[PDB]
Design a protein around this ligand. Structure first.
Ligand code: OLC
Ligand code: OLC
Ligand code: OLC
Ligand code: OLC
Ligand code: OLC
Ligand code: RET
Length: 231
């Protein structure tokens, strides 16, 4: 375990996702409003899944070796299993906040599946140049998601309760900034051009993950927007 220099960041990420899970679980104890229950369920599941996958990387299960560029490169595949389930859950939190139509939700979740699935194929591809073909397709899927969040969701939120509009705007801005950093880290890190070493890459993903899951959830679950309008 400690033989890998990045272990300290995997351990800290495990601890922070675990603590985030427990906090959201206790905070949601006793909430009875059915609308608020939806948001607590979605938002608590996100760090719980990430906890299990950080733990699997810490213990060494979620790591494989991929040959490319004449070397055996360590690839943490467990990240993609986490993101496959947690990134559509985070998009569902945003879509439910603005009462998105069903067709738009399907488009978002489908594009997200394509983004993570092609990222995984790129991470495991043995022909070096082809890794960047998959990165470009995945990045195009991400740009579709970001477009919808700005030129689809923002338009509907502005016609809803003011507390829904303001909370959405903040969570939208947090999401766009944090999610856009992931393709950059991948491209310059061990999966891509290899300019940043794996230990620093692991630190960067851990800061992004904790911010995009526990930070996001703290903003959402402290908002009055998750409760129905009632007397
Ligand atoms: C919110 C409060 C928390 C604030 C925290 C946010 C900081 C996020 C971390 C960033 C990257 C820093 C990585 C450290 C730099 C290591 C690079 C290095 O030293 O490599 C030298 C090499 O030997 C010769 O080039
Ligand atoms: C050190 C602590 C480690 C961290 C803990 C280990 C994580 C894996 C454990 C459990 C799944 C528990 C349930 C996860 C689902 C929670 C959903 C929820 O809370 O739903 C609220 C809603 O209001 C209901 O109607
Ligand atoms: C609303 C959506 C609900 C979503 C709830 C789903 C959460 C499941 C999470 C985690 C366990 C990780 C499972 C990862 C499976 C890896 C098994 C595998 O393929 O291993 C192959 C072997 O290691 C050859 O290398
Ligand atoms: C493997 C990746 C895919 C599986 C991972 C799970 C990701 C989240 C699940 C589903 C989106 C499907 C559409 C669900 C949107 C329905 C929300 C809605 O419009 O409201 C319906 C409700 O009946 C009103 O009361
Ligand atoms: C819209 C928000 C999301 C946008 C996300 C897409 C951004 C893509 C950016 C840049 C490509 C820059 C490529 C630079 C890579 C050159 C690496 C190289 O070969 O240089 C070797 C090294 O510099 C010698 O030490
Ligand atoms: C909880 C973790 C989050 C919000 C992770 C988000 C991940 C991404 C937006 C990943 C994007 C990628 C690309 C657009 C191309 C290169 C490969 C990925 C998967 C890193």
């Amino acid at each position: 375990g400690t033989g890998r220099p990045e272990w300290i960041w995997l351990a800290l990420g495990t601890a922070l996702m675990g603590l985030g899970t427990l906090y959201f679980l206790v905070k949601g104890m006793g909430v009875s409003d059915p609308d608020a229950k939806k948001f607590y369920a979605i938002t608590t599941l996100v760090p719980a899944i990430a906890f299990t996958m950080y733990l699997s990387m810490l213990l060494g299960y979620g790591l494989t070796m991929v040959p490319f560029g004449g070397e055996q490169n360590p690839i943490y595949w467990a990240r993609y299993a986490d993101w496959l389930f947690t990134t559509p859950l985070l998009l569902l939190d945003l879509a439910l906040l603005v009462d998105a139509d069903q067709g738009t939700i399907l488009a978002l979740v489908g594009a997200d599946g394509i983004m993570i699935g092609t990222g995984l194929v790129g991470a495991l591809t043995k022909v070096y140049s082809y890794r960047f073909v998959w990165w470009a397709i995945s990045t195009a899927a991400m740009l579709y998601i970001l477009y919808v969040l700005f030129f689809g969701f923002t338009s509907k939120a502005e016609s809803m309760r003011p507390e829904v509009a303001s909370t959405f705007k903040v969570l939208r801005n947090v999401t766009v900034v944090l999610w856009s950093a992931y393709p950059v880290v991948w491209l310059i890190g061990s999966e891509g051009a290899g300019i940043v070493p794996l230990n620093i890459e692991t630190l960067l993903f851990m800061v992004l993950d904790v911010s995009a899951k526990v930070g996001f959830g703290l903003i959402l679950l402290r908002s009055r927007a998750i409760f129905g309008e009632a007397e």
